[PDB]
Amino acid sequence: STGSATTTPIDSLDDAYITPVQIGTPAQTLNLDFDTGSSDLWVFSSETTASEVDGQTIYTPSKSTTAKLLSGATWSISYGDGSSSSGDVYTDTVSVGGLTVTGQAVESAKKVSSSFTEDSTIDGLLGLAFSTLNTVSPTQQKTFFDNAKASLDSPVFTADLGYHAPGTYNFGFIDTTAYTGSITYTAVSTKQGFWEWTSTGYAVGSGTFKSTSIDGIADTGTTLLYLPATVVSAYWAQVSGAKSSSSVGGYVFPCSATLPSFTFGVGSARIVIPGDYIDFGPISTGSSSCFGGIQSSAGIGINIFGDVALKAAFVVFNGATTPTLGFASK
Numbered sequence: 660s661t662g663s664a665t666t667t668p669i670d671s672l673d674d675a676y677i678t679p680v681q682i683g684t685p686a687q688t689l690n691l692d693f694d695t696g697s698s699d700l701w702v703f704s705s706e707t708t709a710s711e712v713d714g715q716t717i718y719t720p721s722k723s724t725t726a727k728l729l730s731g732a733t734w735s736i737s738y739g740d741g742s743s744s745s746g747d748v749y750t751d752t753v754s755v756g757g758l759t760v761t762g763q764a765v766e767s768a769k770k771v772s773s774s775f776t777e778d779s780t781i782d783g784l785l786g787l788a789f790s791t792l793n794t795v796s797p798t799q800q801k802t803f804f805d806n807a808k809a810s811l812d813s814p815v816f817t818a819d820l821g822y823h824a825p826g827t828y829n830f831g832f833i834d835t836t837a838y839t840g841s842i843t844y845t846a847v848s849t850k851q852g853f854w855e856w857t858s859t860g861y862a863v864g865s866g867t868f869k870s871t872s873i874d875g876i877a878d879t880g881t882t883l884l885y886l887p888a889t890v891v892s893a894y895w896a897q898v899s900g901a902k903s904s905s906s907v908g909g910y911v912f913p914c915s916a917t918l919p920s921f922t923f924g925v926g927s928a929r930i931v932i933p934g935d936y937i938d939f940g941p942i943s944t945g946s947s948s949c950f951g952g953i954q955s956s957a958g959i960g961i962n963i964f965g966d967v968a969l970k971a972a973f974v975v976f977n978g979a980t981t982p983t984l985g986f987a988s989k
């Protein structure tokens with residue numbers, strides 16, 4: 660089997676991407692944030708604290724003839740930005756882009772943090788990291804990908820995120836028309852439950868490539884590119900007037916600037932992030948200070964290849980017995 664679904668930015672900055680997902684019988688379509696940095700499929704629901712719901716579409720398990728309470732199961736998750744959610748668990752039929760999994764754990768939120776409440780466009784998350792990170796207790800549950808993978812034509816999914824435009828998540832096949840050149844594969848460590856890999860270095864604009872190992876995770880659920888302070892300082896030093904602002908919470912730059920590109924290495928291959936992808940716009944409406952899309956990972960504890968980086972590539976998440984990650988230009 661295969662599936663293919665379009666993913667759409669939630670706003671004009673590509674702050675996140677939403678993908679329609681069919682849950683239950685008859686189908687209830689919710690728009691979920693596909694998240695290769697976590698392993699829970701959770702939704703706004705009829706059980707979510709009413710004051711914490713603000714425009715989201717909710718899953719109502721009582722209206723699904725295939726929903727079953729997973730008795731005794733609870734979940735609770737916190738993300739690296741401080742966002743969180745928690746609740747109980749149902750199993751139900753879940754379909755993405757024509758690919759159907761029966762008996763998928765659908766984690767129903769009882770509580771969500773304000774950061775989720777305020778994102779009216781995001782009806783929940785669909786985790787695509789390794790199932791060892793799943794938070795359901797006392798019986799850990801499998802991701803949608805993990806459940807699907809034996810049925811898939813090939814045990815892979817691909818992320819093809821757009822810049823200020825829709826893109827595609829495919830399951831079970833590699834669309835050879837969706838990228839240019841060849842796909843370069845690189846090793847993955849699953850020890851921390853993430854799609855963790857090592858970039859071979861970077862360049863700023865038209866500068867020389869610096870060969871240096873940068874461990875990090877491929878996280879579709881993180882907006883920006885978070886790299887070591889040395890790398891990030893080298894980038895922003897090429898933008899007149901750019902500075903790290905403690906009050907704003909990262910690097911800002913004059914909105915009048917033209918940003919340089921940023922290149923990262925994948926083996927001997929190179930992915931180029933155009934300068935425009937690194938512009939996250941005014942820090943507040945009408946400001947001439949703009950927020951940067953490359954930020955320091957110092958204090959996070961890990962480097963994160965978020966959407967800023969991933970959207971510059973066609974990315975293969977290869978879930979074979981020994982997982983790997985592939986990147987191509989597009």
Ligand SMILES: CCN(CC)c1ccc(C(=O)NN)cc1
Nearest residue numbers: 675694696738739742774880881
């Ligand atoms: C700000 C609240 N949202 C919705 C955009 C989040 C989505 C994904 C993550 C995350 O870290 N995923 N790996 C954290 C938060």
